């Protein structure tokens, strides 16, 4: 009933969103990789920018995601630099480095997702945020998920998202933010 | 029940929004004039920018408005330059100049408003657009309203908004866009 | 000695710049048309933005030009909107429309050019501006040059740049701005 | 001959720049602290942005400095985030944390400075960059200078800038970048 483009060519993000989409939404990947300067100070600003840039180009409803790992004891690092930090290195190398940063520090953290819908015909924009609170593990565990998953333990669990990646579908920042978005869209469309 | 700041110090805009607010919303003017570079290509982009800048500063829910006159035969001019065009001149001078531009041209036009709500605590942003279609009068008539009102005739009428300013409350771009916003907020908050 | 790309495919700008380039500089139009959102409030900001985006992509020295017509009695219009104003219409139609706007007004104006050099390897950026003062003619005359040239008469002359395009090399905003830029470069290279 | 405002109240930058300024230039810290969103991906973009915003407001020539520490094995971190990284913590804590990140890694680094002059009356903008190559020490040493100075050892020396701050005037990124800028200015003023 509604076909919507995603404003990301990140395969892990497309998979994760497709698997929680409502029965009434056909989610397609953008058929063009569009350049976006992601220079927002916050996830919301980057999610909105991407949504707007893709929507103006495609002239069709789009959704975007800007997301990140926030470690409270490190001033919220890496945050909006989650991908850009050590971007030519593997996530395993990034996690080993961040584990060294946290020696002697409080390990509380969150993954945060800002999910944005833009219809460029009507000029309706809806952006909502959600998060999964947790803590950084003391070592990397598992190879499931992607990115920082193998050292993030969600609230309520003792295993990392690398160890129990199936739980992302229920409790991740992305699943929660996009379900929050879908709920709004069900009300207003 | 909800106190919301407006992200505009324009007195005419504050009046117009206050008079259509729902009984559950207390609308206050921003207690600080905040500088915003309005460099968006579209009303939506400027409405979002203002909402975000004020919201991040005030740390409290805000709404913004970016609005303009769009004349189809003049490529949509003045559009986002509605205020900036001849800004040191009176609106009477602006209208006399635009009347000369339109000699021999189709007079169809619209006022367009993008109304944006941002809650910077939750990071929820909602933006919606609406419009009042009409035509440019052949001369300036009346002193009601503000800005280009005295030469804009809405669809369904033969008088300008300068002549019948009371109708803005029912049919203007601003009344319609903000009511559309309020409707969404009633559903999701 | 120095090959430089120009951040425009506007053939008139290319020709105009090539015709005053010093013997030590080879000028090439950019072989890739790079998208830049030209949202600067001034010619300098748009010129810098173009230089930086193009240089970052090309990884080679570039120059950029942002130029426009500034009519003082119209608050500086069209200014940075010189191209975007009625962009789907011919400059002939844009001039006819502007002539109607100017009836009864002061007719003084200037063309303004901001010329920018950027070397992305060294991270050296140099931007200089110049202008040619004049007046708007009562009618369009000549087909020489480009853009608004056929209704702009430079001080010291009674013919438009449409009529005397050969004089642009000597007196235009673009010739003066670029010569100023090349002078700087000659000193510091 | 020329009075110039500096677009910073950082007293160390002020002192450092004043101590190498030529006899013909009077440097004044900006008497108004002007808000700039420093969202550039590079030092040059942030330096230019600051120069332009401050100059537009002050309506007088200004210079700006955007500088940072670039550690190559950390993908160039902290880079443009040099200040923003753990901004609520002391540089001592930031250095301790970075030391932990670097355990077992290549320890090469550079300080980089982009120095920009802007004359808003003429619309002349000049930006030049320089750097000092070095390595990160195994421990924090000295309290001289500012920021990351106490764990950065410039090539040719065995002491940190914390230990030998007097040498910054001669060899630092900021001294070289500004001297390069003043050389240009001496030629073209």
Shortest Cα distance, chain D CAs vs residue A37, angstroms: 9
Q: At what angle do helices D11-18 and D173-188 cross, to 10 degrees?
A: 50
Closest chain D residue to A93 measured between Cα atoms? D74
Looking at CATH, the fold of the domain delimited by B1-189 is given as Maf protein (3.90.950)
Long-range contacts (CB closer than 8 Å, 24 or more residues apart) made by C149-153: C150/C91, C150/C92, C150/C95, C151/C95, C151/C98, C151/C99, C152/C69, C152/C109, C152/C111
Q: Nearest CA to A101 among D151, D97, D90?
A: D97
Q: Does residue B94 contact residue B71 with C-beta atoms inside 8 Å?
A: no
Q: Which residues have CB under 8 Å from A8's CB, separation 6+?
A: A14, A29, A30, A50, A64, A65
Binding residues of C for Mg(2+): 66
Q: Do B40 and C41 touch (CB under 8 A)?
A: no
The residues of C assigned a catalytic role are 66
Best residue of B38, B78, B84 to probe chain C, by most C CBs closer than 10 Å: B84
Residue of A39, A65, A66, A119 with catalytic role: A66
- A125 vs A113: CA distance, rounded Å: 16
Residue D44 forms contact with C (CB below 8 Å): yes
Q: Does residue A3 contact residue A59 with C-beta atoms inside 8 Å?
A: no
Phi-psi region of C71 (alpha: psi -120 to 50; beta: other; left: phi over 0): beta
Q: Nearest CA to A6 among A108, A126, A117?
A: A117
Chain C residues with CB under 8 Å of B37 CB are: 41
Length of chain C: 189
Phi-psi region of D10 (alpha: psi -120 to 50; beta: other; left: phi over 0): beta
Residue identified by tokens 């709500």 is: B117
- C82 vs C76: CA distance, rounded Å: 10
- C86 vs B73: CA distance, rounded Å: 9
Residue identified by tokens 């809650």 is: B119
Q: Does residue B181 contact residue B115 with C-beta atoms inside 8 Å?
A: yes
Closest chain C residue to D116 measured between Cα atoms? C125
Q: Give chain D's end-to-end CA distance (angstroms, integer).
A: 10
- B29 vs B65: CA distance, rounded Å: 13
Residue in A41, A97, A98 closest to D39 by CB: A41
Q: Residue A51 has which token pair? A: 């949504």
Residue C37 forms contact with B (CB below 8 Å): yes
Q: Residue B9 has which token pair? A: 């110090």
Shortest Cα distance, chain A CAs vs residue D167, angstroms: 31
- DSSP class of residue C151 equals G
Residue B37 forms contact with C (CB below 8 Å): yes
Chain A residues with CB under 8 Å of D36 CB are: none
Residue spans of the domains in chain B: they are: 1-189
Q: Give chain C's end-to-end CA distance (angstroms, integer).
A: 10
- C183 vs C25: CA distance, rounded Å: 12
- C151 vs C141: CA distance, rounded Å: 6
Q: Does residue B98 contact residue B42 with C-beta atoms inside 8 Å?
A: no
Residue A66 appears among annotated catalytic residues: yes
Shortest Cα distance, chain A CAs vs residue B167, angstroms: 24
Closest chain A residue to D97 measured between Cα atoms? A101
Q: Nearest CA to D11 among D58, D59, D65, D54?
A: D65
Chain C residues with CB under 8 Å of D187 CB are: 184, 187-188
Q: Tell me which residues of chain B, numbers 45 to 104, contact chain C at a CB-CB cutoff of 8 Å.
A: 74-75, 77, 81, 85-89, 97-98, 100-101, 103
Residue D27, CA distances (Å) to A100, A115, B142, D16 in order: 43, 47, 56, 11
H/E/C letters for each residue in C87-104?
CCCCHHHHHHHHHHHCCC
Q: Looking at the DSSP assignment, which residues form a beta bridge with residue D92?
A: none
DSSP-based three-state secondary structure for C179 = helix
Query: Which chains does C contact via 3+ CB–CB distances below 8 A?
Result: B, D
- DSSP class of residue A78 equals B
- D38 vs C56: CA distance, rounded Å: 19
Q: Residue D181 has which token pair? A: 């800028």
C-alpha torsion angle, residues C67, C69, C74, C77 (rounded to 10):
-40
Q: Residue B28 has which token pair? A: 């206050």
Q: Does residue D177 contact residue D115 with C-beta atoms inside 8 Å?
A: yes
Q: Do A75 and D97 touch (CB under 8 A)?
A: no
- D66 vs D48: CA distance, rounded Å: 9
DSSP-based three-state secondary structure for D125 = strand
Residue A136 forms contact with B (CB below 8 Å): no
Q: Do C88 and B75 touch (CB under 8 A)?
A: yes
Residue in B42, B48, B187 closest to A48 by CB: B48
Residue in A44, A125, A129 closest to B127 by CB: A125
The H or E element spanning position D78 is strand D77-78
Closest chain B residue to A124 measured between Cα atoms? B128
**Torsion over CA: B175, B180, B33, B3 (sign):** positive
- C179 vs D9: CA distance, rounded Å: 37
Residue D158 marked in a binding site: no
Best residue of B100, B103, B106 to probe chain C, by most C CBs closer than 10 Å: B100
Query: CB-based burial of residue B24 (10 Å sphere; 0-12 exposed, 13-18 middle, 19+ buried)?
Result: exposed
Q: Nearest CA to C181 among D124, B3, A105, B130?
A: D124
Residue in B40, B81, B100 closest to C101 by CB: B100
Shortest Cα distance, chain A CAs vs residue D62, angstroms: 25
C67: Cα within 13 Å, side-chain hemisphere? 28
Residue identified by tokens 């004089």 is: C167
Helices (H), chain D: 11-18, 43-58, 91-101, 168-171, 173-188
Q: Does residue C115 contact residue C178 with C-beta atoms inside 8 Å?
A: yes
Residue A44 forms contact with B (CB below 8 Å): yes
Shortest Cα distance, chain B CAs vs residue C86, angstroms: 5
Residue D174 marked in a binding site: yes
Q: Does residue A76 contact residue A109 with C-beta atoms inside 8 Å?
A: no
| DSSP for chain B, written as a single string | -EEEEES---HHHHHHHHTT--TTEEEEE-SS--------SSHHHHHHHHHHHHHHHH-S-EEEEEEEEEEGGGTT-BGGGTTTTTTTS-HHHHHHHHHHHTTTS--EEEEEEEEEEEETTTTEEEEEEEEEEEEE-SS---S-SSTTGGGEEETT-SS-TTT-GGGHHHHSHHHHHHHHHHHHHHHH-
- A186 vs B122: CA distance, rounded Å: 20
Closest chain C residue to D128 measured between Cα atoms? C124
Shortest Cα distance, chain C CAs vs residue D158, angstroms: 28
Residue C57, CA distances (Å) to C11, C31, D70 in order: 21, 11, 22
- D41 vs D87: CA distance, rounded Å: 18
The H or E element spanning position C69 is strand C62-71
- A1 vs A44: CA distance, rounded Å: 27
Q: Does residue D42 contact residue D112 with C-beta atoms inside 8 Å?
A: no
Q: Nearest CA to D131 among D154, D99, D151, D147?
A: D154
Cis peptide upstream of residue C78 (ω within 30 degrees of 0) = yes
How many C-beta atoms surround the C-beta of residue A111 within 10 A?
26
CA-angle at A49, arms to B36 and A167, nearest 5°: 130
How many C-beta atoms surround the C-beta of residue D69 within 10 A?
26
The residues of D assigned a catalytic role are 66
Chain A residues with CB under 8 Å of B116 CB are: 125
Residue B114 forms contact with A (CB below 8 Å): yes
């Amino acid at each position: 009933k509604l076909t919507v483009y995603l404003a990301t060519t990140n395969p892990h993000k497309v998979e994760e969103i497709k698997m929680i989409a409502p029965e009434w939404m056909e989610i397609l990947p953008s058929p063009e990789k569009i350049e976006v300067v992601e220079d927002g100070e916050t996830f919301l600003e980057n999610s909105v920018k991407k949504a707007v840039v893709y929507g103006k180009k495609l002239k069709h409803p789009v959704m975007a995601d800007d997301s990140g790992l926030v470690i409270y004891s490190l001033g919220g690092f890496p945050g909006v630099m989650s991908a850009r930090f050590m971007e030519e290195h593997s996530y395993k190398e990034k996690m080993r480095t961040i584990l060294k940063m946290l020696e002697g520090k409080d390990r509380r953290a969150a993954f945060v997702c800002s999910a944005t819908f833009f219809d460029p015909v009507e000029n309706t924009l809806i952006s909502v945020e959600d998060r999964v609170e947790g803590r950084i593990a003391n070592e990397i565990r598992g190879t499931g998920g992607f990115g920082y998953d193998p050292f993030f333990i969600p609230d309520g669990y003792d295993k990392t998202f690398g160890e129990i990646p199936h739980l992302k579908e229920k409790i991740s920042h992305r699943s929660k933010a996009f379900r929050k978005l879908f709920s709004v869209l069900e009300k207003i469309l």
